[PDB]
Design an enzyme around this catalytic site. Structure first.
Site, PDB file in Angstrom:
ATOM      1  N   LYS A  43     -13.820  -1.901   6.212  1.00 19.97           N
ATOM      2  CA  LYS A  43     -14.641  -0.799   6.832  1.00 19.97           C
ATOM      3  C   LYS A  43     -15.632   0.067   6.279  1.00 19.97           C
ATOM      4  O   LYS A  43     -16.362   0.514   7.043  1.00 19.97           O
ATOM      5  CB  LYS A  43     -13.615   0.574   7.633  1.00 19.97           C
ATOM      6  CG  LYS A  43     -12.457  -0.386   8.401  1.00 19.97           C
ATOM      7  N   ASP A  89      -4.546  -5.789  -7.785  1.00 21.64           N
ATOM      8  CA  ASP A  89      -3.194  -4.870  -7.831  1.00 21.64           C
ATOM      9  C   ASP A  89      -2.358  -5.914  -7.038  1.00 21.64           C
ATOM     10  O   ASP A  89      -0.845  -6.046  -7.355  1.00 21.64           O
ATOM     11  CB  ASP A  89      -3.360  -3.878  -6.677  1.00 21.64           C
ATOM     12  CG  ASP A  89      -2.077  -3.211  -6.812  1.00 21.64           C
ATOM     13  OD1 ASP A  89      -2.258  -2.224  -7.119  1.00 21.64           O
ATOM     14  OD2 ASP A  89      -2.014  -3.481  -5.161  1.00 21.64           O
ATOM     15  N   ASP A  93       1.473  -7.206  -7.588  1.00 23.25           N
ATOM     16  CA  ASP A  93       1.955  -6.195  -6.647  1.00 23.25           C
ATOM     17  C   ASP A  93       3.481  -8.093  -6.101  1.00 23.25           C
ATOM     18  O   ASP A  93       4.197  -7.647  -5.246  1.00 23.25           O
ATOM     19  CB  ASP A  93       1.934  -5.447  -5.600  1.00 23.25           C
ATOM     20  CG  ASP A  93       1.498  -4.476  -6.933  1.00 23.25           C
ATOM     21  OD1 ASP A  93       2.054  -3.824  -8.265  1.00 23.25           O
ATOM     22  OD2 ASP A  93       0.308  -3.053  -5.978  1.00 23.25           O
ATOM     23  N   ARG A  98      -3.920  -9.824   2.731  1.00 19.15           N
ATOM     24  CA  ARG A  98      -5.083  -8.518   2.916  1.00 19.15           C
ATOM     25  C   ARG A  98      -6.173  -8.096   3.668  1.00 19.15           C
ATOM     26  O   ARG A  98      -6.468  -9.567   4.027  1.00 19.15           O
ATOM     27  CB  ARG A  98      -5.239  -8.067   1.261  1.00 19.15           C
ATOM     28  CG  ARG A  98      -6.067  -6.772   1.423  1.00 19.15           C
ATOM     29  CD  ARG A  98      -7.163  -6.099  -0.147  1.00 19.15           C
ATOM     30  NE  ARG A  98      -5.774  -6.044  -1.409  1.00 19.15           N
ATOM     31  CZ  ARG A  98      -4.941  -4.894  -0.794  1.00 19.15           C
ATOM     32  NH1 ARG A  98      -5.342  -3.530  -0.530  1.00 19.15           N
ATOM     33  NH2 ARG A  98      -4.360  -4.950  -1.813  1.00 19.15           N
ATOM     34  N   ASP A 160       1.930   3.372 -12.573  1.00 18.22           N
ATOM     35  CA  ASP A 160       2.667   2.700 -11.203  1.00 18.22           C
ATOM     36  C   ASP A 160       3.542   1.400 -11.951  1.00 18.22           C
ATOM     37  O   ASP A 160       5.177   1.749 -11.732  1.00 18.22           O
ATOM     38  CB  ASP A 160       1.299   2.173  -9.878  1.00 18.22           C
ATOM     39  CG  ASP A 160       2.234   1.070  -9.606  1.00 18.22           C
ATOM     40  OD1 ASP A 160       1.948   0.185  -9.799  1.00 18.22           O
ATOM     41  OD2 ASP A 160       2.303   2.205  -7.998  1.00 18.22           O
ATOM     42  N   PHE A 225      -4.097  10.107   1.450  1.00 13.15           N
ATOM     43  CA  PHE A 225      -4.362   8.717   1.279  1.00 13.15           C
ATOM     44  C   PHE A 225      -3.611   8.053   1.289  1.00 13.15           C
ATOM     45  O   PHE A 225      -2.788   6.876   2.039  1.00 13.15           O
ATOM     46  CB  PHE A 225      -6.359   8.826   1.645  1.00 13.15           C
ATOM     47  CG  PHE A 225      -7.194   9.504   2.163  1.00 13.15           C
ATOM     48  CD1 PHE A 225      -8.967   8.947   1.080  1.00 13.15           C
ATOM     49  CD2 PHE A 225      -6.912   9.220   3.728  1.00 13.15           C
ATOM     50  CE1 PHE A 225      -9.626  10.232   2.682  1.00 13.15           C
ATOM     51  CE2 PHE A 225      -8.042   9.770   3.985  1.00 13.15           C
ATOM     52  CZ  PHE A 225      -9.223  10.247   3.784  1.00 13.15           C
TER      53      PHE A 225
HETATM   54  O1  LIG Z   1      -1.621  -2.366  -2.636  1.00  7.76           O
HETATM   55  P1  LIG Z   1      -2.006  -1.136  -1.735  1.00  7.76           P
HETATM   56  O2  LIG Z   1      -3.265  -1.736  -1.753  1.00  7.76           O
HETATM   57  O3  LIG Z   1      -1.204  -0.540  -1.053  1.00  7.76           O
HETATM   58  C1  LIG Z   1      -1.800  -0.164  -3.539  1.00  7.76           C
HETATM   59  P2  LIG Z   1      -0.833  -0.158  -3.986  1.00  7.76           P
HETATM   60  O4  LIG Z   1      -0.553  -1.356  -4.994  1.00  7.76           O
HETATM   61  O5  LIG Z   1       0.117   0.706  -3.348  1.00  7.76           O
HETATM   62  O6  LIG Z   1      -1.139   1.204  -4.599  1.00  7.76           O
HETATM   63  C2  LIG Z   1      -3.509  -0.609  -4.304  1.00  7.76           C
HETATM   64  C3  LIG Z   1      -4.774   0.458  -3.905  1.00  7.76           C
HETATM   65  C4  LIG Z   1      -5.966   0.512  -5.443  1.00  7.76           C
HETATM   66  C5  LIG Z   1      -5.136   1.424  -6.554  1.00  7.76           C
HETATM   67  C6  LIG Z   1      -4.271   2.365  -5.863  1.00  7.76           C
HETATM   68  N1  LIG Z   1      -3.701   2.357  -4.715  1.00  7.76           N
HETATM   69  C7  LIG Z   1      -4.500   1.293  -3.852  1.00  7.76           C
HETATM   70  C8  LIG Z   1      -2.688   1.042  -2.507  1.00  7.76           C
HETATM   71 MG   LIG Z   2      -0.643  -3.081  -4.142  1.00  8.68          MG
HETATM   72 MG   LIG Z   3      -0.087  -1.227  -7.019  1.00  2.01          MG
END
Ligand SMILES: O=P(O)(O)C1(P(=O)(O)O)C[C@@H]2CCCN[C@@H]2C1
Ligand SMILES: [Mg+2]
Ligand SMILES: [Mg+2]
Ligand SMILES: O=P(O)(O)C1(P(=O)(O)O)C[C@@H]2CCCN[C@@H]2C1
Ligand SMILES: [Mg+2]
Ligand SMILES: [Mg+2]
Ligand SMILES: [Mg+2]
Ligand SMILES: [Mg+2]
Lengths: 334, 334
Positions: A43, A89, A93, A98, A160, A225
């Site tokens: 967006k 990330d 994860d 995405r 995290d 957020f």
């Molecule tokens: O994986 P997203 O996009 O939900 C997440 P996160 O793994 O939950 O923590 C990745 C993004 C960048 C770092 C901070 N959180 C946002 C949200």
């Molecule tokens: Mg993530």
């Molecule tokens: Mg993460």
């Protein structure tokens, strides 16, 4: 809506600038491939805010075509930083999708080469800042702003992963104090401080108290957020969100699990203990069923209401001497 | 030998400074864990050079205890950058050992969390520069130097991965032009330009031509160091090198394969084609046997001799007005 086409259209200038050493084109060709996948289909709220704030804070007579060119470039820098963190990330994860498409590292022929792609995205931020803003008086301020936002987000990622070791039971880790620390750092990723500070510095607004006031509104917003993102991980429709949730499977210190633990009876704690942090579809289903039994969706809706009113209250207190409209436009997306 | 204990002993101050938010200690605790594994057990040549060059280039009366403190810190910054690239390069090359111990990401409980560790290493560079050198006149110069070395090395990594897609036959990619491009960028990683430039800027030597002359000596040296690394990947003793080679298995545009292709008959090209870029021990053995049949070890020894004399020739031409001893100490390690 009004600044977008010219933001998006600059992308071509961005790619040109880096490319112009026959060698270096190949690497920018892959950067180009990586951005077209990984920074196209969003967006663009964060990137566009640099421009939208630029035009609010710099008097129209000072808004020449070159300063706009620099502003578009800095907005794209915010989009490169976001993509850097997201590419990496998703690997960490073990995510699937995405933006409604397969995560970049899941693409055949990419895999763990996505580690380098991410690093290249980050490297390209500072090159573009050098190439566009090097002779400008705010140049150091902007380097330090990007470096500091990146540091904060990174500490967040570290906390995290540390709170969520795979294969382990520990809900004991999942405290309200622990979550408040993680989110403070993760909020840096969502906060519009980075693009609004950038436009401020570009406008010659560099006072420490004015920056601290804005940072404070914007950080509370960033925290909301992240809590919304935690909520949507399980209760969001993937066709709206663009991504399949992994928090339960990944053993994460989510807002949802922290609220569960605060409201669970001893037997409900045992169901969570036996089912959290595992890959089996039927175990994740059990955790989701428990959250619903605890009315966590209703609790989120109420938190969202409470949090919106608080952010508005901070805007009323802390916006001056910036126009409240700087903050209210972004808040419209809450 | 003489600056080491005080370089290494500063590590404790480095970790203290970042740690001193109860939260942030945990992340620096993992940084600490990561560095103790990943930036402890090396020869520290790159980091120590900042100090060794500092003392050569700043008159003793200007070498107060605080400027030394800043110099030790900047040397460690060079060690953090190196560790950043190595942590990530080992994941991407599927490597087993480094420095005689299992690669960090292969450690149970680490895995792809090593992606974040690497990023944390990099983030900590710029924090320490801010905390130690922010009020100094050379502060921006040093940020830009680290950012630029990191960019160059990154482009190198990108070209390395692009020329070596897994599962494919293409020796056609492995040209002398292609190798010369890759190595130019990879040399940035080995070049002592980053730590010698840092000490120069700290000494108030910031002239562009003096920097360009030094960069030119140091880049040719960096190229030799990469060719040596390519040679040692196969012909090195792992107990001396500390690492198991993966270049053949990984389908890499190595110096060894480029020299092979230039000297191979059509049948020898077919042996290479059928055996390169695959995991089977017996296929790698076949490639190594071919390299030996082509006298590639003798060719390397001669290249090393030729290259040493050339670097010495560049020192004679380009060192002035810096003391030749800046360059000759490092050359002693060729
Ligand atoms: O994986 P997203 O996009 O939900 C997440 P996160 O793994 O939950 O923590 C990745 C993004 C960048 C770092 C901070 N959180 C946002 C949200
Ligand atoms: Mg993530
Ligand atoms: Mg993460
Ligand atoms: O894995 P190394 O240490 O041999 C290597 P590379 O994968 O061959 O290329 C990693 C280092 C950092 C980047 C430049 N090359 C050096 C050498
Ligand atoms: Mg999430
Ligand atoms: Mg390697
Ligand atoms: Mg490599
Ligand atoms: Mg190697």
């Amino acid at each position: 809506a009004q600044e977008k086409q010219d933001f998006v259209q600059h992308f071509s200038q961005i790619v040109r600038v880096l490319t112009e050493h026959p060698e270096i084109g190949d690497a920018i060709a892959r950067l180009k491939e990586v951005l077209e996948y990984n920074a196209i289909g969003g967006k663009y709220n964060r990137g566009l805010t640099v421009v939208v704030a630029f035009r609010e804070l710099v008097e129209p007579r000072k808004q020449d075509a070159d300063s706009l060119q620099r502003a578009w470039t800095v907005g794209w820098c915010v989009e490169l930083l976001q993509a850097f963190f997201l590419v990496a990330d998703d690997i960490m994860d073990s995510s699937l999708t995405r933006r409604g498409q397969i995560c970049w590292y899941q693409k055949p022929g990419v895999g763990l080469d996505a580690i380098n792609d991410a690093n290249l995205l980050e490297a390209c931020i500072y090159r573009l800042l050098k190439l566009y803003c090097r002779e400008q008086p705010y140049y150091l301020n902007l380097i330090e702003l990007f470096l500091q936002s990146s540091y904060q987000t990174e500490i967040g990622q570290t906390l995290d992963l540390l709170t969520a070791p795979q294969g382990n039971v520990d809900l004991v880790r999942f405290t309200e104090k622990r979550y408040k620390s993680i989110v403070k750092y993760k909020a840096a990723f969502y906060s519009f401080y980075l693009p609004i500070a950038a436009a401020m510095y570009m406008a010659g607004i560099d006072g420490e108290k004015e920056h601290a006031n804005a940072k404070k509104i914007l950080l509370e917003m960033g925290e909301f957020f992240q809590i919304q993102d935690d909520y949507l991980d399980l209760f969001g429709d993937p066709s709206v969100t663009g991504k399949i949730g992994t928090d339960i499977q990944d053993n994460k210190c989510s807002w949802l699990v922290v609220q569960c633990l605060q409201r669970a009876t001893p037997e409900q704690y045992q169901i969570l203990k036996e089912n959290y942090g595992q890959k089996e579809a039927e175990k994740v289903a059990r955790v989701k069923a428990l959250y619903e039994e605890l009315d966590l969706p209703a609790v989120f809706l109420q938190y969202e209401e409470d949090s919106y009113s608080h952010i508005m209250a901070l805007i009323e207190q802390y916006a001056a001497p910036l126009p409240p409209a700087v903050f209210l436009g972004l808040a419209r997306k809450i």
